[PDB]
């Protein structure tokens, strides 16, 4: 008759009545995003999202979340990428990310597209998800930089990549973290994130307050003394080192 909340370090949570074994299994389980408001509500088995419908957390009463389902039929499921498949629904956006960021021309000279805040947010705010296919450090490190524009180290065994042609929003928009440009004076950082659709990935989180329509940037963090990096970054490392 009791409800349980299980938080991840990133601030997302699973919430619901657990079954006889303390498992998040049932028809009224929810994943709640770190805004404590956007939710995916429905059928879960041992914490894995089978059918999550988009909802808004309207209140909690005695610890129990009360949701309203959003109109339409936006449904989501656990859909972890593989080495060759980025997503079963490449064009289905993440509903939390879609309210926080958009892609447009970067303000950085010659940098192509960039990622921008849709609204004003405070520090420590998760803005965007960096999902991609999962490949090895060996494959990535043993191939040319021209193929490594979007590679992100996840851990000691896995690199996340958004390979062509999925680097174009018309082909892939389920997540947008690969659209954030680099800065040596960034307003965001990469952080671990456990996503109900993508699984274990990284996210982009603000390290300070950001304004509406501000470009989001992250330090790519290439090794400066192995520099092991693409030319544009090396040219920029020089400039940045000068300003110091």
């Amino acid at each position: 008759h009791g409800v349980c909340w299980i938080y991840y370090p990133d601030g997302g949570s699973l919430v619901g009545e657990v079954n006889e074994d303390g498992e998040m299994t049932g028809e009224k389980i929810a994943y709640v995003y770190p805004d404590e408001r956007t939710a995916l509500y429905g059928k879960f088995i041992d914490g894995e999202m089978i059918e999550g419908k988009l909802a808004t957390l309207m209140s909690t009463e005695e610890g129990r979340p009360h949701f309203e389902l959003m109109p339409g039929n936006s449904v989501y499921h656990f859909d972890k990428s593989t080495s060759s498949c980025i997503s079963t629904n490449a064009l289905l956006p993440d509903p939390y990310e879609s309210e926080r960021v958009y892609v447009a021309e970067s303000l950085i000279s010659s940098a192509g597209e960039g990622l921008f805040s849709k609204v004003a947010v405070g520090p420590n705010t998760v803005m965007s998800f960096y999902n991609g296919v999962r490949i090895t450090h060996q494959e990535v490190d043993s191939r040319d930089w021209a193929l490594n524009g979007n590679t992100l180290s996840l851990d000691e065994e896995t690199v996340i990549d958004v390979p062509e042609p999925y680097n174009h929003v018309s082909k892939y928009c389920a997540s947008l973290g690969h659209k954030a440009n680099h800065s040596f004076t960034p307003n965001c950082i990469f952080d671990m994130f456990v996503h109900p659709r993508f699984g274990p990935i990284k996210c982009i989180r603000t390290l300070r307050a950001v304004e509406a329509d501000e470009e989001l940037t992250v330090a790519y963090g290439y090794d400066h003394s192995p520099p092991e990096a693409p030319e544009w970054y090396q040219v920029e490392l020089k400039a940045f080192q000068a300003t110091q």
């Binding site: 450090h137 990535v140 490190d141 191939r143 930089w145 490594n148 590679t151 992100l152 180290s153 000691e156 690199v159 990469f190 990284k202 992250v218 790519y220 963090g221 290439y222 090794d223 092991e228």
Partner: peptide, 7 residues
């Protein structure tokens, strides 16, 4: 490594 954000 030829990827972002390695430890």
């Amino acid at each position: 490594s030829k990827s972002k954000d390695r430890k």
